[PDB]
Every structure is written in structure tokens, then in C-alpha cells.
Design a protein around this ligand. Structure first.
Ligand code: NA
Length: 200
């Protein structure tokens, strides 16, 4: 059912092109900030450390995970940083564990999107559907506290949200796309602003 869900994501991009183009440009800006802050191994280690020390906010982690995964060679580094974040989050607490868990999840999610898309416009369409999956995944974690805050538990909630997202009605995916455009604009504006100050 992924085909029909992509069709509803494309309608949202056609019905709000100015917002979707802003998100796509905010995504390339995150890629530039991370690419230009130094080598991909330098930035990833730096991004992991700042996240482990509670200095990267949730929006700056979203932006860094995108920027580190928008390069094929970066995908290997982003995957390495994902496992390091999970092994560091397991030996951490509070914000350290929480921030590194998001970092681990978002790195692998962005590598997945980047691998499953052939250009930036295919990425924007697929990311719209994953945004609905995340909301469905979040409610699953909110309804069930026992659900593992662990990376392996969030991904299972995401897969369950992704399966339910492919089969959602047209208007549900459509409205989720307009919200993605709205939220991604704010998140990436603050996230890139914060990555800029910390990485240079
Ligand atoms: Na870099």
C-alpha cells in the first residue's frame, strides 16, 4: 500500500508547494552545515559528544541526523554514529540517554529515506509518509510506558506506525503532509541555526 500513500504525499506537495520547497531547502542547508563543518568523521564525533552532553536540542539532533545522512559516503559514517549512540545511550542516563537515543534512531531513519529515494524530491515525498508513521509510533509509546524507550523499542513502534501509515485514508496522509511541512519548517530553522553556532 506504499504506492497509494505516496500518491497522497504528492498531492500535499502540489497543494502546498511553497512550504514543501522550503522544507527541501532547509534539508539541503542542514547537509551543507554538516558537510562544511569539517570531515564527516569529525562532525559525527562532535555531534555525538554534544548530544551526549545535553547540548544539542531535539531540533538540532533532527537537523544533524539529516545532514549526516544526505551523503552516500556519509551514510556509512551515519550508521556508525547510530550504533555508537546506542552503545553510549545504554551507558548513559537522563538527557544523555534520551538525546543519544533520538540521534541513533534519526540517523538510521534518514539513511533509510536517503537510500530509498533517487533524488531530493523523492526524499521529500517518502519523508511525508514517515512523518505520519512517527506520530502513530509516538502515540504507541505514549499509550504504553512499558514500551522500550530503547532504540530497538522505538523502531518497532515506528515499523508498526509505518505499516498503519501505508493503509491510512487519503485525507489522513494529506493532512499529515501539511503538518510535516509546518513542523519541519520550524524544527529545521531552529535546528540549522543551532548546528551553525555549535559546529563552527
Ligand atoms: Na562533515
Amino acid at each position: 500500500g506504499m504506492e497509494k500513500a505516496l500518491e497522497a504525499a504528492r498531492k500535499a506537495i502540489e497543494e502546498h508547494p511553497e512550504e514543501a520547497k522550503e522544507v527541501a531547502e532547509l534539508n539541503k542547508k542542514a547537509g551543507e552545515i554538516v558537510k562544511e563543518a569539517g570531515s564527516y568523521e569529525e562532525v559525527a564525533k562532535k555531534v555525538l559528544e554534544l548530544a551526549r552532553e545535553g547540548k544539542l536540542s531535539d531540533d538540532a539532533i533532527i537537523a544533524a541526523a539529516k545532514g549526516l545522512a544526505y551523503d552516500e559516503e556519509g551514510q556509512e559514517v551515519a550508521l556508525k554514529t547510530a550504533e555508537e549512540a546506542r552503545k553510549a545511550a545504554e551507558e548513559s542516563s537522563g538527557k544523555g540517554k534520551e538525546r543519544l537515543t533520538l540521534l541513533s534512531f534519526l540517523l538510521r531513519l534518514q539513511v533509510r529515506l536517503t537510500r530509498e529515494s533517487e533524488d531530493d524530491e523523492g526524499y521529500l515525498t517518502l519523508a511525508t509518509v514517515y512523518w505520519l508513521a512517527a506520530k502513530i509510533a509516538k502515540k504507541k509509546l505514549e499509550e504504553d510506558p512499558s514500551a522500550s524507550t530503547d532504540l530497538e523499542g522505538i523502531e518497532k513502534a515506528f515499523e508498526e506506525g509505518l505499516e498503519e501509515a501505508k493503509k491510512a485514508p487519503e485525507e489522513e496522509i494529506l493532512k499529515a503532509g501539511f503538518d510535516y511541512f509546518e513542523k519541519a519548517k520550524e524544527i529545521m530553522e531552529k535546528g540549522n541555526k543551532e548546528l551553525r553556532e555549535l559546529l563552527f
